[PDB]
Amino acid sequence: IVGGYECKAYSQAHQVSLNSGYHFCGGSLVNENWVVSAAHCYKSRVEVRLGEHNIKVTEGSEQFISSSRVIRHPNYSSYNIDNDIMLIKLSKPATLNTYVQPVALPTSCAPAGTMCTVSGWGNTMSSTADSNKLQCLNIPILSYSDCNNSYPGMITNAMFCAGYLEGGKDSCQGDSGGPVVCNGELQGVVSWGYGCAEPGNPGVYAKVCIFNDWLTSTMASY
Ligand SMILES: [Ca+2]
């Protein structure tokens, strides 16, 4: 997260760290057994760390659970990073408490102008911002025209832009797979962008509201 603020410890209870010897992506707990991330974060096996604030310090709030299965969207395509969503089945259910809570899947798509929160342990491009403690950022959803203008012809129906065309504030590498929460629901998944927090290069997110049929269909296929 570039230009954000350190989140109030555990204010983002659904936030998870994806770890394979080190933090490499984020994810969102959507229920006791499932995590939503980015298909570009795919690994056949990962350890999901819940209840985290400072990933480098044991706090007593964490839960480490290995995955029983990692399922990328059947239509994911890397050359254009389309359908950049993945489901992770936990090997054992998370324990919900003061530190671990799921985030609800969107009923409907949020329109342009909606103010949202993005969080993560990715690069902050700041000496002063410690990526080891969860960073938060409020970003507005951009219009389709501003989005397509920024990345001509590269925006599909499974993407939306959010952030600031002037730059300075954005998600960054390491934040990928993380949540974009708007009015208490998971609207996006940190996906891609050109650089981080650069003028004219807003962040691009996977558009969760068009994947609801696939998501629920899969969560019912345990
Ligand atoms: Ca910790």
Side-chain angles (χ1 to χ4, degrees):
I1 299 283
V2 185
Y5 61 99
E6 179 185 338
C7 313
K8 299 183 62 65
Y10 319 105
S11 49
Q12 320 292 334
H14 50 280
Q15 176 81 49
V16 310
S17 169
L18 306 187
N19 186 299
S20 64
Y22 51 95
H23 164 89
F24 67 94
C25 278
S28 295
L29 183 69
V30 299
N31 69 39
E32 294 184 4
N33 297 293
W34 293 97
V35 167
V36 165
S37 201
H40 83 267
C41 288
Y42 181 83
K43 282 185 185 51
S44 44
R45 81 159 192 180
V46 296
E47 182 179 81
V48 183
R49 312 188 160 188
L50 309 95
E52 287 283 21
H53 188 61
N54 180 333
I55 47 170
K56 274 328 182 171
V57 155
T58 292
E59 299 152 309
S61 40
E62 18 327 61
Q63 305 171 38
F64 302 180
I65 307 174
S66 325
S67 52
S68 45
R69 23 172 25 200
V70 186
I71 314 162
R72 269 166 318 203
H73 191 277
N75 304 123
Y76 171 65
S77 76
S78 65
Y79 83 92
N80 64 162
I81 322 178
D82 194 25
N83 298 309
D84 196 15
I85 196 173
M86 163 179 88
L87 273 175
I88 302 167
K89 184 152 44 52
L90 293 176
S91 59
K92 74 168 162 64
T95 304
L96 322 178
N97 51 34
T98 303
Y99 312 110
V100 174
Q101 291 298 324
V103 64
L105 285 189
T107 56
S108 287
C109 310
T114 308
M115 190 68 125
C116 304
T117 308
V118 67
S119 48
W121 291 283
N123 194 355
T124 64
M125 288 173 169
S126 172
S127 265
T128 327
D130 182 6
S131 69
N132 286 319
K133 26 246 285 225
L134 189 67
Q135 304 288 307
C136 273
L137 174 73
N138 296 295
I139 54 168
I141 300 196
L142 301 185
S143 60
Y144 169 77
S145 64
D146 266 324
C147 188
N148 178 260
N149 184 250
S150 298
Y151 306 101
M154 294 192 279
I155 307 304
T156 73
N157 51 38
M159 322 180 172
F160 63 92
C161 291
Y164 304 94
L165 293 163
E166 53 284 26
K169 308 197 306 200
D170 195 19
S171 60
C172 199
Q173 292 192 103
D175 295 316
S176 308
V180 178
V181 184
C182 319
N183 299 155
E185 303 195 328
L186 186 69
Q187 284 291 162
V189 172
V190 178
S191 182
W192 65 275
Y194 281 9
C196 300
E198 279 147 51
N201 308 171
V204 191
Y205 302 88
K207 192 178 199 177
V208 185
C209 67
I210 71 176
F211 297 102
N212 281 48
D213 281 345
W214 177 84
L215 290 172
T216 72
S217 210
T218 300
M219 287 192 288
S221 352
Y222 273 90

